[PDB]
């Protein structure tokens, strides 16, 4: 029942990130009609989602039906409501910017500046992973309201995490995002 629904809502578009992350994956919301189990993808650049004449769309059907008992396997391709407010593709974009030749010193700074300019209470992109030498470091950026203990870390604030497969090693990002809502006017 609810456990299987939570498992599918946490897994179905999250195993799509093994191939859909190149198109600008940003998570999904479950819209479960009793007629059919709708699945959505928020594509930053959904031209690749359109596919090489359907080559990309039609790879999301066999797994959905062979082992999950779903009717009408379909995923409409849309985009996220706000670009910088979604933290997952922001972390993916920062990792790609590191991997591609962008200023790895300045990529995290520009990403944090863009996210805080997009209407956030606070943000922090922190990069744990060996960027230059053979020893691990940290590149934390501190700006804006980011509470760490209580209700906001439970549900109010979210996380954007990615990976980075470099030749020295593999790292990621931890961009914290809080939606601009007042907690307590005390």
Could you say whether residue 160 binds RNA (CB under 7 A)?
no
Where does 12-150 have alpha helices with state H? Answer: 17-20, 47-50, 62-66, 87-100, 104-117
Taking a C-beta distance cutoff of 8 angstroms, is the pair 83, 54 a contact?
A: no
Could you say whether residue 18 binds another protein (CB under 8 A)?
no
130-149 mask for RNA (x: CB under 7 A)?
x---xxx-x-x----xxxxx
- Strand segments, DSSP code E, in the chain are 31-32, 37-42, 75-78, 122-124, 143-144, 157-160, 163-165, 170-172, 175-178
From candidates 7, 150, 179, 180, binder to RNA by CB under 7 A: 150
Restricted to residues 70-129, the positions that interact with RNA (CB under 7 A) are 122, 126, 128-129
From candidates 67, 154, 181, 182, binder to RNA by CB under 7 A: 154
Alpha carbons 28 and 75: distance in angstroms, whole number: 10
Restricted to residues 120-159, the positions that interact with another protein (CB under 8 A) are 154
Alpha carbons 15 and 21: distance in angstroms, whole number: 10
What is the contact surface with RNA in residues (CB under 7 A)?
122, 126, 128-130, 134-136, 138, 140, 145-151, 153-154, 161, 163, 165, 167-172, 174, 183-184, 186
What is the contact surface with another protein in residues (CB under 8 A)?
1-7, 9-11, 14, 30, 32, 154
């Amino acid at each position: 029942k609810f456990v299987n629904d939570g498992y599918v809502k946490a897994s179905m578009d999250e195993y799509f990130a093994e191939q859909l992350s190149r198109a600008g994956y940003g998570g999904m919301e479950l819209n479960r009609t009793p007629m059919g189990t709708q699945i959505v993808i928020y594509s930053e650049k959904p031209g690749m989602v359109i596919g090489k004449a359907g080559k990309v769309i039609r790879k999301l059907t066999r797994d959905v039906a062979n082992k999950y008992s779903l009717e009408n396997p379909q995923i409409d391709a849309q985009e996220v409501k706000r670009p910088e407010l979604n933290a997952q593709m922001m972390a993916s974009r920062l990792a790609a910017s590191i991997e591609r030749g962008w200023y790895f010193r300045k990529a995290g700074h520009n990403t944090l500046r863009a996210v805080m300019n997009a209407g956030a209470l606070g943000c922090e992109v922190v990069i744990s992973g060996k960027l230059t030498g053979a020893r691990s470091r940290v590149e934390k950026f501190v700006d804006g309201y980011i509470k760490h203990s209580g209700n906001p870390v439970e549900e109010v604030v979210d996380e954007g995490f990615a990976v980075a497969v470099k030749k020295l090693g593999t790292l990621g990002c931890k961009v914290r995002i809080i939606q601009p809502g007042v907690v307590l006017p005390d």
